[PDB]
Subunit: 253 residues, 4 copies
């Protein structure tokens, strides 16, 4: 369990990030949620987690394009919650086009959120974790941090960058009670994906998965949350600077 610990999860107002925050809450950690969305819907989620799990849950809507807003998210977590034990760098965006057709605005944006936000968040958290003599940094990368797909140049470059950044973090913290690892999911069934799915649908789901994901099954936010729980546990104290692939066999082949 993680009673007495505080976890910040970026981009946790929905999807994977919310699944992770929810799993960490269920182990007793206080939580900082982050992301965009409807004010009322977010408050429902925040109040609901706090009441269901008996922990404190803050919401900080910091826009993570801006490195100063990222470092301020972390510093505010420490101000409001007392400490920061676990940082999950999860927020991300996508844009598909050929390299030649790839808008520079999208390239820049993808790197800023998907990579540089990891740097800024991690830079802000480390001094606290080192003083504590305890930390877990869990970066949510992708199968695309290890291998590539056509038409995803910026996202693949950024995720790969996250993997290498994760390894450096780990080497700079080795033996100080801090680990840093990257979870690399394959396909997770988010509403964005759900659109693409629409001769019936569970024949369409299987067909969409079959190119990359041999199990023909989606990964779930709940499974990624249990993977983050595991990495946050004492059993994972010597797991550092590595990747945990949660991808249905995508990287096996």
């Amino acid at each position: 369990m993680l009673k007495g610990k505080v976890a910040v999860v970026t981009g946790s107002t929905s999807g994977i990030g919310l699944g992770i925050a929810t799993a960490l809450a269920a182990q007793g950690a206080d939580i900082v949620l982050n992301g965009f969305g409807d004010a009322a819907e977010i408050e429902k989620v925040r109040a609901g987690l706090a009441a269901q799990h008996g922990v404190k849950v803050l919401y900080d809507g910091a826009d993570l394009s801006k490195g100063e807003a990222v470092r301020g998210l972390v510093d505010n977590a420490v101000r409001q919650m007392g400490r920061i034990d676990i940082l999950v760098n999860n927020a991300g965006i996508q844009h598909t086009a050929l390299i030649e057709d790839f808008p520079t605005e999208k390239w820049d944006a993808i790197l800023a959120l998907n990579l540089s936000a990891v740097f800024h968040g991690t830079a802000a958290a480390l001094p606290h974790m080192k003083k504590q003599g305890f930390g877990r940094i869990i970066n949510i990368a992708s199968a695309h941090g290890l291998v590539a797909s056509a038409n995803k140049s910026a996202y693949v470059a950024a995720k790969h960058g996250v993997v290498g950044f994760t390894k450096v973090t780990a080497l700079e913290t080795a033996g100080q009670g801090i680990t840093a690892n990257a979870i690399c999911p394959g396909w997770v069934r988010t509403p964005l994906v759900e659109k693409q799915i629409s001769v019936d649908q569970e024949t369409a789901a299987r067909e969409l998965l079959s190119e990359k994901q041999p199990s023909l099954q989606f990964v779930t936010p709940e499974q990624l949350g249990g993977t983050a729980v595991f990495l946050a546990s004492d059993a994972a104290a010597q797991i550092t600077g590595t990747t945990v692939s949660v991808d249905g066999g995508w990287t096996a082949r």
Copy 2:
């Protein structure tokens, strides 16, 4: 938890394998132990796990250097325990020598136990797992299944072979309720390593010096950590983790 499930752990009479068996028993799994040592101590271990955790624990002394014995261990497990949910292929041996000096008998011994026994155990377990709609194969490889050290050609070859074999097992079973993964530990503080650490400064100073070459954390991995890693791969959160390696190595493979 793993109540009602059955785990066979090869090489579990001591060390990493016993750590894994223990962690699995503590989640409620029935256990088949295996390996060598003193038979009185083995029975003490077996009885004590069963009493402490309220699970059924068997011992099967199969010599895993023999393919038909590995297969019989798995078949005996199913016969006696009723099913097989988790197979941990852990038993392993080592020899250090330059390649040109490496005895053929040692090459062949290391391949037979560290690699071929994973093939034989997997082959026997898979039909049962596919019929159950559930299985977890957990192969204990090493950092030396991903990277090399000088003078360890047979161990490195076999552990690499285990990593690749793990991937194929995952691809043959993908979607069938079965996963196969390889845990890749760095240094764990066994009696053997202790003897090296024994070999002018303080004990814990020599420990850090010895870890220094390969393990950035300068902290040993423990059998309990590796047991909790096996518990996690056996859990439902790990249902889509298949055909991959989980490195428990203090930063060894990050650099």
Copy 3:
């Protein structure tokens, strides 16, 4: 032999990019040098290479830290040479500091040069290559595109990003007569590195205890540009004396 082909080598005024341009010049490709330094001491080079190997050798001083300058270099290299056959993305900078001590400006500068310049060059080069039906993108990454060292976060991240970017470039051009690959060097005795103790510096990372040389890297680029390397695409070639083997 590469006669009738044009190579752009970014960062070719010194160290490995020059090493590579020279090696490629020695095979009959026309060269576009690029980089910083004395306008005249570079003329010595642009002149001495063109005379030594009997090829056209341009110079473009484009600051690659700007995305539009990269795409200009490429488009101008086409205009001044007629075509582009080989793009070598080599220009790169370093900075060593703990992550929490790492200046954001240095972070952004490493990412703009070491990574985004590679995206920019490739975006500019690709339409010409796809029409040519022939291309060689060779990105000069590092051992640090595959593994990490402490205190080098922006560089390791950029270099991992290049490796990943190379793979996508390969996948988008597959079967179109274009390949993209990354050479991942270990230690090279540059000016910066040069400043015995030479075996002990290599000792931590590079088991051969021998430096990699620009001519070696030049040979490696020449190979990837060859017909034998036609189905070598989307991959890394480590020239690192054993660094990544352990």
Copy 4:
């Protein structure tokens, strides 16, 4: 070029090993051929290469499933040729089946030849190379030494073992003028692959060229086969001085297979 140098290429009577042996002979290297097939055709090959390239070419038909025979091939190459500069460990066999259906005899045969022959060959070569202060060991692994495919358990395990073995070899010889690397090809349209094209051809009840494009499509984004000449060219590169600090690594020649 390799004038004055001796290369041993296992499994060089056909397919990839033949392309590699030819490219090395074309650089001035003396060649020991090895492998099976039709003996008249093998002699035509051996005499042909010797004459065409003006180098010495021998055939040793050692069965490399036996470790003594592998060491014997290397020993006698040094006896008969004067030295050994290049060892290309290339011979291999394939068998497909589900793991639970995979005959123990086929598992053993694929480990013996595809992995243990690399150990025996390297072990016999190294003392000579270390003495000479020069050597190139080039192991022909596969994309399957880095990633898997279903139904190829023994072959994927053996190829992965070759990749790890190659790394240890590099580390043991680092700095001594010896490098050890593994070329990792994707599909090459040899008879090893033809049997597979034919099996896919019959499964889907389709022609042979449907099967080829589809075989390629599953794995190899270029949709073009790799050729023995390309692999020969890659081996010549690794044997060169340009590759002096390329050691303990893999070179994928796979049309994008491992990029995705």
